[PDB]
Design a protein around this ligand. Structure first.
Ligand SMILES: Oc1cccc(O)c1
Ligand SMILES: Oc1cccc(O)c1
Ligand SMILES: Oc1cccc(O)c1
Ligand SMILES: Oc1cccc(O)c1
Ligand SMILES: [Zn+2]
Length: 257
């Protein structure tokens, strides 16, 4: 099935998912000099105080921390968004090496990893109806660089050895995603897509300018996970990032002067 290898990676996905070559695919390179400040952007609001995490899952292409989204609890609003978007899961993409791993790039610079906090537009009732809409989803993307440890990531790192292989899950209650944010909420935003199959064009992307720092040791624990299931040949879960796609007829907007 699809993956990140030579034989089933990003350059192959268009054969099962023709929208891979569509008009608003993600990720993209963010050219910081051509992005334009947009005074029409409203203040961004990340409201994660009542977030209810449930579980952490290795799905064979990343690990997802999943949330109870059956009520307004952890939401994103403001900035480019109309209405309220509810947090359902987050996950990361990372490299085999510190020099690559992110999906978005900034003036062609690749970060060591990228966090995606996925939210759906509550006008559409649930996530599955939201992914049928061009404004169904909003993803907060956050770059990771290797330097000082991020304390609010350590509870994630310490449970990874319990979900080493595809299809494994563990309880992951009482996790506070506010510990994964940087200080500043300055961001770039543009319309795009899922970066994994089915690559649907539903997404308002909001990519924070300030990266978080994680330690070498934290990111090395991500690279011990496996793409395969238990009892199949071991393939390390590394380089699970899609490269930058053509910008096409889009402009990237900046929240900051
Ligand atoms: O916006 C630009 C224009 C020319 C070279 C480049 O790296 C970026
Ligand atoms: O693990 C999950 C839970 C919810 C939505 C999704 O895309 C993945
Ligand atoms: O965390 C989740 C995962 C799947 C569906 C859902 O509504 C929430
Ligand atoms: O599950 C998702 C949802 C939206 C964008 C993305 O890259 C992944
Ligand atoms: Zn992602």
């Amino acid at each position: 099935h699809w993956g990140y290898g030579k034989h089933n990676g990003p350059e192959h996905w268009h054969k099962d998912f023709p929208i891979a070559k569509g008009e608003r695919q993600s990720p993209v390179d963010i050219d910081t000099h051509t992005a334009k400040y947009d005074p029409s952007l409203k203040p961004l609001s990340v409201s994660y105080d009542q977030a209810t995490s449930l579980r952490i899952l290795n799905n064979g292409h990343a690990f997802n921390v999943e949330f109870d989204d059956s009520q307004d609890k952890a939401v994103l609003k403001g900035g480019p968004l109309d209405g309220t978007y509810r947090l359902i899961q987050f996950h990361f993409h990372w490299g085999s090496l510190d020099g690559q791993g992110s999906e978005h790039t900034v003036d062609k610079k690749k970060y060591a990893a990228e966090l995606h906090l996925v939210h759906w537009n509550t006008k559409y009732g649930d996530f599955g109806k939201a992914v049928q809409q061009p404004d169904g989803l909003a993803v907060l993307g956050i770059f990771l660089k290797v330097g000082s440890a991020k304390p609010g990531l350590q509870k994630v790192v310490d449970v990874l050895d319990s979900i080493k292989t595809k299809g494994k899950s563990a309880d992951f209650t009482n996790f506070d995603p506010r510990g994964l944010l940087p200080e500043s909420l300055d961001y770039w935003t543009y319309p795009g897509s899922l970066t994994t199959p089915p690559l649907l064009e539903c997404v308002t992307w909001i990519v924070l300018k300030e990266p978080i720092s994680v330690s070498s040791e934290q990111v090395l624990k991500f690279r011990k996970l496996n793409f395969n299931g238990e009892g199949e040949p071991e393939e390390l879960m590394v380089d699970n990032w899609r490269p930058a796609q053509p910008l096409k007829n889009r402009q990237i907007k900046a929240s900051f002067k």
